[model samples]
Target: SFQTQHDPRTRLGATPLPGGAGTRFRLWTSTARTVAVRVNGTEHVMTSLGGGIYELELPVGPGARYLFVLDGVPTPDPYARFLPDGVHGEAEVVDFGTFDWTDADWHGIKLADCVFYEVHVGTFTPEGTYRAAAEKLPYLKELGVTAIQVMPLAAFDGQRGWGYDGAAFYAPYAPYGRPEDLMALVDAAHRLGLGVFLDVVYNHFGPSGNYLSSYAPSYFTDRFSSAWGMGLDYAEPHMRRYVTGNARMWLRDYHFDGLRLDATPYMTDDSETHILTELAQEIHELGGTHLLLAEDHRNLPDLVTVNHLDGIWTDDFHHETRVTLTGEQEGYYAGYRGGAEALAYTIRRGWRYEGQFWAVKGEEHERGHPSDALEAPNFVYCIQNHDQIGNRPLGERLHQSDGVTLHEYRGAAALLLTLPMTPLLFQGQEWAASTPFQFFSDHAGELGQAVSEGRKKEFDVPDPQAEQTFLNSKLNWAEREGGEHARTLRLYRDLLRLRREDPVLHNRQRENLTTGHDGDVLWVRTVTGAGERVLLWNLGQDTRAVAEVKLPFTVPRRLLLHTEGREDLTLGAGEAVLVG
Candidate 1:
């Protein structure tokens, strides 16, 4: 093994690693000034080999333990399992090198062909661990989903959270599972042909239980402000290496297919060549076909359209659907466009804010880019997300059962899966779960309580019982056993299956949508090689049926699916139809 840098150990580990199959070993180091070679406990100051990574050639000693002293401070050695594992500071190294990998030929899932469902582990199931989540995989696979995107699982301050408040950079959150448990998930997913994407936050660290600050000084900065906290000091050379290194570790070690970068909008970098672009290029060079997805609310299409990333979450399309369905005029929902025409056009076409003014930021920030970006960018579409659902005044769906509740939700779901854009599912949304997905965290002692209370108290008017509200938001999986939730699940399962198997519903062509609306009824056409599909939504209260709606194109088409007709009985009130 080679030490990329020097260590103060005065004596380093072995010099050359054994070449046989059983001689395999793992190596890692946070920072190294210099390293020395120590074969059989003797010291050979490796001035030439000492850099950052201390390499060793220890054969037949997979269980061997060692340490690297950074700047003369002896830290726990590599192959060390739990480094100060969660406020305990106990480090142990187990055999991670011999875990059998079952997926050898999995290239990856096609981005264009995927329907991602994002979930928070804590509320996704009763147990809320990787082992517990294993039970839900079959459910998602049966839903015709191509992949599942998990909210951040990096170690955080508390047992319960959206995973946004991460503390440990490499370790999986304790509540969710261990590091190897995460590996089990990847392996199982690959065996099932289900690609998984993990949402990672590099913008800022969580408020509490962050040990990186104690270990490394350059990790963060008061230099800039992010919504959650201090910005990552990406400009600093060491800091850049640390963050980018974490990215590499996840890909190489954990074998994640792709990562969805959370909160790129809060970046305050003022550099000639941005860190994101550099990181994008670096990952590509590492033989990575891995996708880079950014979550940016900045409305700057360049953030996603620059070809450095696969895409950015399309809030414009999301808002347009919301407005057309519910006519909501509060917060960012005010940016929604009017009529079924707008909803149909945006969902089918991938562009509505094409030079239109956006009231949210008080600016015009797009120009038919989702289509323009068809070759390079992925336009994400979803009706309800963790943030939108949790940020509500009372953590309620925008439209309950009264106005645009069931129909609009169903209509939005229909359009999302059928449209050219990629669709995303929030946890429990499949079952129409009445349980709110409110923001909750567990920091413990003072910080945990403060966050739990502070988050609930964040809104202008506090909840009568803030703590209960936080607890109540957790998904009651038992609730899925009956009532509207069960029916909703069956409806979703059928629609997703149709979207997946039926040729008429499988496609990605923004130009294929031919749309029109008479009163509250919305009509649209989606056609391509897979087949042709038409979606009809009654966003308004009164529903009316018109015979033989004229399709947008002159090409001859056949009716194949309908939600509210004898044509397809399985469809719901806000139904979608398909044809050839």
Candidate 2:
């Protein structure tokens, strides 16, 4: 048995001393000649502990707000646990032991059994607060969701933006609620038997309100340029520790079941022990059933087979499905010629491109790698996610596109839920929500103006920095109770229930599954010792002959579930049926 205890007091931050007698403030900066803690208009000098670490034990307790003054310049703590006053303001001391957690008996859920519901806390509900989001956990549980994948909550510069551009790595976003309120959310999820996973951005900090460079120039390096900005200097020992420590903070302090690392391809680390590997090693050493997932587009199998990660998100499934449904072949969709064969191949292989030339518009490049060594559950499949929906010109969901009928949308959704791989649903996806998840932010002055103008340069869109843009993204909860939205919800609930209750469908072995296609009709069959199940999907505009589709098993089997509530296997246009 691996034995290790993660004590939060030994971490780099403002940790409360024993029995609230005092607090210990710690920071690491090699360039700082002098360091002091400024609390409530009082500045107390700190002692250098060599190796560029500064420490000060002040006669203060929880609820004390302070900043670090380096050479007469004051800045917020990069490792602060709570920044009640935005990112540019003072950092407040948080007492993690105060929260009454009832999940002591809670062990995390396995990755194979997880039905992820991706939630953007700011837009998941009308109130956009952690307390409000927690109130809806029972509803999600009833919908057959086993896990909640929360988007980034790290402290960013704005009041209304996706937490991807988080500046303060340790602090929770103040607009969502207090640090204790977030703890309440996690505790409630665990009590409901729902594992909670957090999405974290470690590649680069946001452009605004990022003060790490102010403390020490060595914190970042110009050796690499990421899509957002300069890459993080993981070559430095302190910088590497900062990221690994942040990952542990979420799993240990907040009781999260796992973490989803965002855009890992940009995290260029030249160190002998890659930062990804080091971080994964540290997380596993914690000795719990915690999961680590990556959002990498490289489709490298080593990330899971060698790097000790649970899974990686695959965009190939979404791209191929979208192109087939909407007949869209522009931009990134240019390379994918969607057909029944293409869809069937993706369902079997988990990814479309494996060391193949992928063309986007007129540009071409080799993308992806061989991933046959990975298991089915190692690939997280989703029809729609934050990036797929929010990165569009108008931020339209798959259902919003013209020319695609509702039947086709339902058929695609059935494929997503019944597949052998893991499935993740975006917030409001169950109800087929009509609201668009537009890109929105609350940055001020020149930075805000530049963001808005940059968006306009591509295509006409809602101003990202406007309040209305954020407001428009809020889910319409009322729609979930009536009309077509309610019908879609019923389909999702039934499908998930079937996936959980059926033994053959629950098995995620890639070898037990086989797929084939005939023109516009595709078929996927799964067989195990328990039983066998097959899904027939029609993507064409007209009714297709079920007999035309080739499958290992015979047709005209007993119908298990249908998208259009049909009893017979007629295989209508844009209809899907699961039979055994």
Candidate 3:
């Protein structure tokens, strides 16, 4: 049995002491009899502070490079802050307090106001660096996005990745730019009134270049395993510090407004106080409203409890939208029929599979356990994401699939942008760019070969290790200036603006919202104290009139937005309208 609500507060990593004269460091290792810190090329033996913990003080401060030596063999620190020469190289000490930040009065955006733009730094722009990405912050601010959720910045073993396979927990990828470059991005974002969030992988470390197994095997758990790799030992105190500290480092050091925790379902723990719950508490206590968004499919409302995570990425909406648009029900999507009723049910409720018998598992199961009704703002909804798009055989966007007309796409947009939840858009999705975000990496040696083999075994796509595959994921930024792409971009921009400006829409309400369906026409009527707003969407291919449903009022409606050339009482196929 593991202890609950108890942490020795062992800060594992280099802590640059104030005044910049020296630094204190801590590293955990159960296998090594001797441990030492090699600073700038010299070795200084460390003292064992008991319980597999090693500590030492270096007569150096910021810009000082060091690594840990275990019984004469040098290895990079597991908690390195600055990995200047990639994951396999030496670790350098960083002074997070030294940077001059410009955002003084930046209080993060409200949950209801967040329109997230997910960016994978490696391929987001032509330059694929933090400095380059920061230069485009003004454009996103102008486009009405309140926050930017950066993909995993933890160091990985290559030039490019989706950033999920990260090895160094404390360092940003070298190719994405230095530590200050990331700080500068956050500073720039804050100045533009844009909240910056980091996507972190806590479920498992990368398969390659992860040296923690050599130093301390106890850091990984044998009780549970993940498809990505070995699961972290969340039940252990030191392991808990490693994870919780990483979370704090980003917010406290990098000035990030929040974090997007990836694949939380894989973060298995048997302790009484589950690591997820504990981690949530640790992060929330850091003060200032820093959002902790759990990327879990579990859909349990407890994840969004007042003391737990701020929100969870709700994929039920996306799946329903995908099923309705593409009509492809293969694989896990087989459970979703994509009917208008089911779509409405998911929109108003949290999870579609609330305690129902899961067909794929062949038994009654509990993934997202039946829970209390969660507020709509606690659910982050999106039309398409990295997994939804990149998991395809050829990495096709939802709009690129057959039967997905531009009109249908715009109707979907109207639904997504108007819904009472946080909205997220993948890069290039605003303009419907032609580029596909396929799985790409630059792992070398046997590790790279294994990734290539895995891709071939799983899908019939091109080689994942191919340079062309990485090249293809780079966004075509120029396409946002012309034709239907520009039109879609404008529509997205306008809808986001409307969501931000509309008093009834901006004030998200899960309890007062009523959803119903008549044939293919779905209506979501937002009932608020001030006024009432109704959004109607005709998913059918022909004209349909809004069906009569019992309502609080018989007032005439005014159209706010519509895909049709003109607004009328009856809507043509693939048309949607929002009314007040």
Candidate 4:
């Protein structure tokens, strides 16, 4: 009965019957002429329920391990709730009722209030388990982030890769812990007044261990192409239900506050109702203050304006900030220029490119749409994220990259925290953790060799398949309390505290904001019914007088926070100050 009453089709996975009486198993596979449930070395033939569905009810309760025998070949359940034996292994029945959830009174956090800390569970802690990450919640709460945006937890082929190459959409990655372990993590976050959001990949499944094609070839469409081969067939009702059902499972069962859809431009659908709109509608119908965001590179405004999404991750801020800090013009960074004016313009407008033609790697393409009508909260801004860091050849954090001084990093961080848009911080970013988030995977045999060689072909990177690659990515929690890391951590905490306590800074209205830059100095001023606050930034290598920077309003004499620990009008090199 935990399944949605209106959409009985959502009961596609192994569901525990009420009172632990039994478990009902259901699967949708039109290609399977025969289907049987293999449980504890015994096979139970399923009754064909017409339409492409097969169903069976067993006396077994929650811990039953089973696999569907399709035409005598065993395959894991597509909607498995727990894959304790990995993706190619048996699927375990998960009882959502078993966990004693303490978040009965918890609603959710608003999008405007979210200070997202993106975390990869495997790398966030040395143990790489949900319970271990849970122990660090207090540190994050004290760091002042309202929410922890956990990277994709979906089960992938191996033990160590990023969760993006997920095969089992419904199951939590086994290496991290069991289904209840994740529940406890979310439960702990809620009791601490922190919201948890999950990153879900619906654009495409992982390269290996995905058995969807074996069950139903039509689950994917040959009509459209994706970065991976064919696209998901959302035109099919069952396929649509599968995708949308997964979204509800995270929110309703796991207690996730929201989902950040990955690579949405690749999710092509031919249905009259686009999959995104349908997914958004279904999730909102569940009620509460749940949010929905997209990591779409297209920079389309309609995602928020028409598709009803809460916000979208904007790369302009990160790209421009990178160019400004590094002075590198190769690859995608070629389209951008580094200076105070560029940073100022990006701060004033949510994004820089408004459908402007830009050439990258010899290919010219139109990028971004006008975002003037959208509010500040509609865009999620960050200087570093998993993609921005991990995709680099050596997986270098901005501070570790060539020519990026600590002072410049602190200045960029201050600007990011004080902006009107929702800001996201990568794990260990507050204290400038010393480890790099390199790309790693655990595929075996030829596939592993292929991945290793492929990574070498692209760049002179460490072997992605090596166990050490994964081990090297873990955060060194010890570094946070030392020297420069401690100072950076203090700066982040103080700025976030100001953003939270000051109504003028927290307000997301675009009309209340004004931005300008003089030579290498940038300033942002925000005025609201609560009060007036301005952020003056010096992005140069030498200290400069702030009096030269012109603004519409008079500068407030009261100094609230400064990166250089100064109380004067003159700004230090790579310094940012907040004044009232």
Candidate 5:
């Protein structure tokens, strides 16, 4: 341990001591050799708080710039948001209270009303500024969406990312435009009556640029590493406040309608009130119809109920649909297609792998969450997502597969919008924007090249170039290509219309639900809000079409929608059908 030159008498005062006005940020560190905080432009040496924590009082306002000089080395502040030029460049103070709010009448989307549209600022447009994206609100509004869940805006190691690698917990990346630009977008969205959702990565800080450890030792722990890096230790009271406070800052300051908690399954905390649930409770008490959704691969029901979360992203729907529709039985897609039996399980049970033996997990893992799994629009399901399409080795669309007809694809699209839970539509998914939603980054110079190298190393594929190949799948908006792309999108528009016009196609499906299968043909019949809607998926090789469906109700069931019946799709080699 380093010898302390300052007296311990400073710790005895709890009356918010009048320390220097500049470097007021103090963090707890259980162990550290040395720590000094950079306040404004000067260094205010911190006194230890016994457990590795170092504290420095600041007279600076909200937009103050500060980082820690740990062990006599300069480091970026973990909570520093406004990285003006770049990660290594100067960090501007993030003014949380300065943004003006105009969404006074807006209350945000309720749990049962969420239909998410996830977008990235960079790829969403060529300019990729917040103001540039604001122009698309009218178009998104017509698509029948309830909320827009944008990827992370916090400062990160590079200019471009999937945005899961945010190093600065409290600041917006300057490359994505200043914090003011984001506020403008939020204000504009509220005026158009759209709810905003944020995708935040609280699991790990980026390796290259994060400096929280240097200044604030209590900010992270070496105890556990996540899929990205060392997991944050929220077990400590101060650390808990910091994490929760940062997340709440978005809600309280930036005016985000909801937060899509990114990958909470990786959080190793075992507190009595799990951090996820506890955060939800606190957010609820703050008033208004704020929502909390999770991108949890683990289909935990208590996370939805006991935790009081608004919704969670369900990956099983994507898997089961992929398997049943395309018959691809490998990786996570291997255990998916039980034909219509799986579809019925998805409809009634919520998870395709619910209580099933997984060769992937090397164990039989299963869960029966609760009776009301799919009751609300809690599980957001999508036919196409950024990761699903962008991660493709060939960056090829599902329609690119040989022998799949447009009719089959339309059937799949029909099944998505007419489902029980909330539907999430990817950009250009409406008309099958023919443009591959490839993984693209604009991390100039050596950083860009480094990202190019690191991209291919993560995925398990024969050729690493597959990662780079998809990095440039730009959204081609030419008008001449009228074959598959144009028709694919028209199918989405039609389904959205069908959902609104038909009551039986509502989100709340009836309790009495059953799944039956006959070889390749699977049939599902469940009471939606008004009547019994029958869904038949011909998971077989040949064109399996049945004349009629058996149902319980005596009321006349009108043929409201059918994927096979739709004229928009221009079939590919492999195709699936959806009928009601």
Candidate 6:
């Protein structure tokens, strides 16, 4: 049973009891006959609580470092809060209550109206610390974004690279900053009226620095296999508790406004109450506003069936835009054609594939058709993200590999932001960054060698273990204030401003949207409560005459916005216009 009304984190791990009496420690390990806690350097015996649980009490408050000794072998706590020395070192106590929060009256924003800016803490800034990243919040707020999505903060093996390899579920990456630093970042963001969402990996832990299997062999089930590793045992009682407890901890302790669940399809479970539905119920019972978004590759409708999740990161819009603008058809890209037509259908209908035969999967997959009941706001659209770019052979962005000129990138930016779906912008995308976001890791020994060789053969990229690979991924903030980069940044800021302030652009009702594309031009005629607006885009290098576009309404129309300022309504090559 999941504890919906209470914080389950107190029931396990090194929890400090109130009034400074002591910290009660609990460990669940069926592999060891005896368990002991080594505080600092001294050994303290623990009492068996039966059913594979051992308990002990230590006269320590916060900042205490300890390791669990199981069957005479020492191992770090699986639920450790602070790993000062790294993942392989001892665990330190963290008092989450220390940070003084000023956002008590700060209820989070709804998922429907957010302009999400996704970033990795390490590569977001040159400094790459929590405090440094927090300093950039005012800029994001000024840029017209409603929220920021942080990459995984859980403890991983190295000092750099993307954080998807996190193994320590409860601990923040120590190199970034202290636990309070993360809280302070959230606190600062809330004060600035920007909601903070965390991208968390629950499907599987990273290969390196993971110790969950040592204490509990049942943690990973042999029944199902995930892409990363053995699937998590969500059916078992203790294992379910661990998974649910971690979600609540992030919400309650760190004060995150929401969670962006990574690769939810991999969370294989056959229980009567699905883990996602149960997690949503727990979040609702916690008594505050929180959004839940899932990265479902197959576009499962049940993930957002009212009581489950709030939204999904829809890739249909991206694929169509990519296939149209770039004209690159390889791997999954081969599934999409009719560029402008594809983009139009995606805007009106939520997904490109509604039970279409997928060549990549070699199966006909089911998807939800867009209805009046299912709002379009539940979809998150983006031109590029960590996976779409970082998974490439050289981590090239749209501007580099796709033959996308600045004019075309600007047009795609307009399409992404003005659409009915929620918009997400990857870090450095606003300024058309020159830095590459490659896949880099720092796992040592055999695991490191395997990852290096694997990525080398698969993508023909640099060594994952090399220090230079991670260094090249850092963003140059100076780019946003100069030359063509500055112009692109201005375009993003303006479009997001329209999404937030313009009524027709922010409207979520998909049934009211009428859209289609003819040759190089695409148009979406949106009918909202406020008024009706038409968005136009020219995808090719040739100019499109106004008479060529079929208008849904034949009336005197006022041009609301255009990519290029001209005397006439004729759209120039690779330009977009929004009319009312």
| Comparison by TM-score, 3 against 6, better one | 6
lDDT of 4 at 60: 92
Q: How accurate is candidate 1 locally (lDDT)?
A: 0.62
In candidate 5, stretches whose alpha carbon ends up further than 4 angstroms from where it belongs are 1-66, 70-72, 361-376, 401-403, 440-471, 477-484, 507-529, 537-557, 564-580
Q: Write the per-residue lDDT of candidate 3 for residues 241-287, one digit (tens) a residue.
A: 77888887898789999999999888888788787777777776677
TM-score of 3: 0.95
List per-prediction Cα lDDT, in the order shown.
0.62, 0.88, 0.83, 0.88, 0.65, 0.83
| TM-score of each prediction | 0.81, 0.97, 0.95, 0.97, 0.83, 0.96
- Which regions of candidate 1 are displaced past 4 Å? 1-84, 91-96, 304-307, 348-351, 354-356, 361-371, 375-377, 397-402, 460-471, 529-531, 548-559, 564-580
Scored against the true structure, residue 554 in model 5 reaches a CA lDDT of 36
lDDT of 3 at 37: 90
Per-residue lDDT, model 2, residue 195, is: 98
Supply every candidate's count of residue pairs whose N, Cα or C atoms clash at under 3 angstroms: 30, 0, 0, 0, 27, 0
CA RMSD of each candidate after superposition: 5.8, 1.6, 2.7, 1.9, 6.1, 1.9
TM-score of 6: 0.96
Q: Tell me how candidate 6 scores on lDDT.
A: 0.83
Model 3 global lDDT (CA atoms, 0 to 1): 0.83
Error of 2 at 574 (Å): 0.6
Q: In model 3, which range of ten residues has the least summed lDDT?
A: 1-10
Error of 6 at 170 (Å): 0.5
Where in model 3 is the C-alpha error above 4 Å?
Answer: 1-10, 361-367, 545-556, 564-570
As a TM-score, model 1 comes out at 0.81
Q: Which run of 10 residues does model 1 get worst, by summed lDDT? A: 2-11
Query: Given candidate 5, what's the lDDT at residue 444?
Result: 51
Give Cα distance to truth, residue 240, candidate 5, Å. 2.0
